[PDB]
Amino acid sequence: MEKAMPESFVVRREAHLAAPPAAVFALMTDPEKILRWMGTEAEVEPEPGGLYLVNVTGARFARGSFREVVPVHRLAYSFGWDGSEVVPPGSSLVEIDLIEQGGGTLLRLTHSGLPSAEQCAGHEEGWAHYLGRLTEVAAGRDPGPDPFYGRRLEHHHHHH
Template sequence: MPDDLIVRRETHVPAPPAAVFALLTDPEQILRWMGTEAQLDPQPGGLYLVNVTGARFARGAFREVVPVHRLSYSFGWDGSEAVPPGSSLVEIDLIEQPDGTLLKMTHTGLPNAEQCAGHAEGWGHYLGRLAVAAAGRDPGPDPFYGRTG
């Protein structure tokens, strides 16, 4: 897999790993920073379904769930030919630090540079909102609300 088709993000989150893990796996908590509705069953084979923008559903299945340390799930978009449901892989590691958690995210299996750029923008946006929510603040209305692409 070409290295330029991998999206990598590292974000410092001012909360312990358990709190960050809950923000990633609890259907009510994920909505504090991303999406308008969510169905999450964080166990291997369990459903990952989030209406990210109010107009676009991300769908996949959890592959690996190590509470408070690691998640991986297949990922794609309902109705997308470029990145259909389950066609890519998101891996997230949570590393405890004295002042919070280092979140390391890798997104692989995207088909081209255009999709990588779009997903890199999306991950940067949403991981920033996650860090705000983890700090106990309201990230405010999502400027990506209503996006279909």
């Protein structure tokens, strides 16, 4: 009936970036550049040994599980969007692929799993904004939107 990995439900999205594939990887390879567009706390390749991990939301993922790593090319790993319950390893699969093209760079995103419609509708809307925000950075840094971050000469408390 539905033993492991119930149903299928697969979501795929595409986007056109005017920047090369190397620039896109650099953004996901740099923990500080991410804070410029989303991410309140990120840390990658910390102590010797190499370890990619970023807390996109909350702080739940039980244990990491890298499947395949290919810099400036493609990435394969799972962790869930943490948009509901917890989404443990195997419950969903996230993959990002970079393809070089004459007119900008094409980025393909596939997210498998989605055991509930709320996660499907939430992930579809979540990935659209995430991908849309990334395009703004790829086509130009310093995003117009200021969901939380937006430094612009702010006053401060005077000494007393």
